[PDB]
Write a protein that binds this ligand. Structure first.
Ligand code: B5V
Ligand code: MG
Length: 537
């Protein structure tokens, strides 16, 4: 018996192995903060961009007071709560307060707009939605009004700022009350997957498997109480939350520093001010920092570890990390769905430069298969399938996609093309899945294509990735015009999609109009040949 339905537990034989192995320790996720605050109450746990500062005892107490405040509002025991917050202390407090209240955080990104928020809110049956007031020029309270209109289950809107007619997040506060602990085998939080279908899919992560993800990652990356970690990616990104991210830093007793943006302006200042020792970035930001040290004066010497992942970092800039930034590079090839691959900190530089790591867990199982599902020969390229103690067995409330995406014996089809080296390290070679990787931001083609086809001048749309030297891929929208109507150009389509509620990183970089798409012999749109036509071949 589980608190939520709609997810796929591990078979009992696997659960037993993972507990017997010490991977699944049987502790709720919020207990990482409870135990650290008990052992190191007066250590500095959290620093925000302004310079404000909180000890472990202070953070633990505020999480209890906000958890009691959430319960007074009726948020708790299994309720799903959509969280959309910037890199501020409000996110860290509320994350633990929701866990202690028994609520299941549904983590979204600040860039997400009405179509993503409404979909995840109604899929999760969320009862509350947590937003900033105004963030980067956008008023999220209008979005909460639109979300509540489309999703009647949303009873409460909690606002980090001026709350308007809603509830101020700072007012969610009451005297701590004894709260029951969740079952560690239950879902702890729901992550948003980059997606390969028409709708974003939610990833359930349990207390046991997410704690192991965090704990094992902190060991591999050498996180301990000396670690000062700069959160450069959104706090809701799996990389910055758990790999080892801020949760790993808190679990071991280090200091979390919240960066408002990844710009050298904000990040380099915080690295010098707080003596940051570790951070994680996507490759486009790595390239920016590697350039920017040539004209920025910040003292970055305290930096010891730069994690780079989300897309493949080139071997040439990888080799520049030590001379330019004075720290160790760690390549990270991971996914919200589970499997994490890390280069080890003392790997020879050859493997740090040329590979995307080897799996985190001894019980991470990998297969590399050809187009027929058969295992490839050693060192051949094929699609990565994986199964392990923190990889999901199914998405949340997505039975049809689960039937397509997981093998009969529980292997998750990643859609990534890789080859495995004799040492066990992986090299990422490409992608099979119909999803564009734009600077670490994942764009489901079919989701974007369906939005574009809602435009009155568009009959059919095919979204195709184009190579980009610094961004990895950019997005080309190939359009068949509506009969007797003109298709829109790039700027009009961007405005249409933005008004529709599509996140800005999904807006096509380029529009190409054509009378028909090339098709295969089954009749599916041939995007390999669309790429050729886009390039004038
Ligand atoms: N170093 C890399 N080199 C080439 N490709 C990479 C890659 N790292 C990710 N990818 C692609 O991203 C994934 C889905 O993305 P994600 O779910 O958003 O999570 C993350 O990126 C993420 C990244 C690091 C740590 C924790 C995470 O969670 C994969 O499937 C693959 O396509
Ligand atoms: Mg250094």
């Amino acid at each position: 018996s589980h608190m939520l339905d709609g997810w796929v537990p591990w078979p009992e034989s696997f659960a037993r192995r993972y507990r017997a192995a010490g991977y699944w320790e049987g502790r709720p996720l919020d207990r990482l903060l409870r135990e650290r605050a008990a052992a190191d109450p007066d250590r500095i746990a959290l620093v925000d961009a302004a310079g404000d500062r909180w000890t472990y005892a202070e953070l633990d107490r505020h999480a209890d007071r906000q958890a009691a405040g959430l319960r007074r509002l009726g948020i708790g025991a299994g309720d799903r709560v959509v969280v959309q917050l910037p890199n501020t202390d409000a996110f860290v407090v509320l994350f633990f307060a929701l866990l202690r209240a028994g609520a299941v955080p549904v983590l979204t990104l600040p860039a997400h707009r009405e179509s993503e928020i409404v979909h995840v809110a109604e899929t999760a049956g969320a009862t509350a939605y947590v937003i900033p007031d105004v963030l980067d020029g956008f008023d999220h309270r209008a979005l909460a009004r639109a979300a509540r209109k489309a999703v009647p289950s949303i009873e409460h809107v909690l606002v980090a700022g001026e709350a308007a007619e809603f509830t101020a997040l700072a007012d969610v506060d009451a005297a701590p009350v004894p709260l029951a602990e969740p079952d560690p085998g239950d879902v702890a939080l729901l992550l948003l997957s980059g997606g390969t279908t028409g709708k974003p899919k939610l990833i359930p992560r349990t207390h046991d498997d997410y704690t192991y993800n965090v704990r094992a990652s902190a060991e591999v990356c050498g996180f301990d109480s000396d670690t000062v970690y700069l959160v450069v990616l959104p706090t809701a990104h799996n990389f910055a939350l758990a790999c080892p991210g801020l949760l790993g830093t808190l679990m071991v007793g280090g200091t979390v520093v919240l960066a408002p943006t990844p710009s050298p302006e904000d990040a380099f200042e915080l690295i010098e001010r707080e003596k940051v020792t570790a951070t994680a970035v996507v490759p486009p930001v790595a390239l920016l920092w590697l350039d920017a040290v040539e004209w920025e004066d910040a003292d970055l010497s305290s930096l010891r570890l730069l994690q780079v992942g989300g897309s493949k970092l080139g071997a040439e800039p990888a080799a520049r990390v030590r001379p330019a930034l004075g720290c160790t590079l760690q390549q990270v090839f991971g996914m919200a769905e589970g499997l994490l691959n890390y280069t080890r900190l003392d790997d020879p530089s050859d493997l740090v430069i040329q590979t995307q790591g080897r799996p985190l867990s001894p019980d991470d199982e990998i297969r590399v298969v050809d187009e027929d599902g058969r295992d490839v020969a050693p060192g051949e390229t094929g699609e990565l399938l994986t199964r392990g103690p923190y990889t999901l067995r199914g998405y949340y409330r997505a039975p049809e996609h689960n039937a397509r995406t997981f093998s009969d014996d529980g292997f998750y089809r990643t859609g990534d093309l890789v080859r495995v080296l004799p040492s066990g390290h992986l090299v990422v070679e490409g992608r099979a899945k119909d999803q564009i990787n734009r600077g670490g931001d994942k764009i489901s083609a079919e989701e974007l294509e369906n939005h574009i086809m809602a435009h009155p001048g568009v009959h059919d749309a095919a979204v195709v990735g184009m190579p980009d030297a610094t961004m990895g891929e950019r997005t080309c929208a190939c359009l068949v015009p509506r009969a007797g109507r003109s298709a829109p150009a790039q700027r009009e389509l961007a405005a249409f999609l933005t008004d529709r509620g599509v996140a800005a990183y999904k807006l096509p970089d380029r529009v190409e109009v054509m009378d028909a798409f090339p098709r295969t012999s089954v009749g599916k749109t041939d995007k390999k040949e669309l790429g050729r036509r886009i390039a004038g071949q």
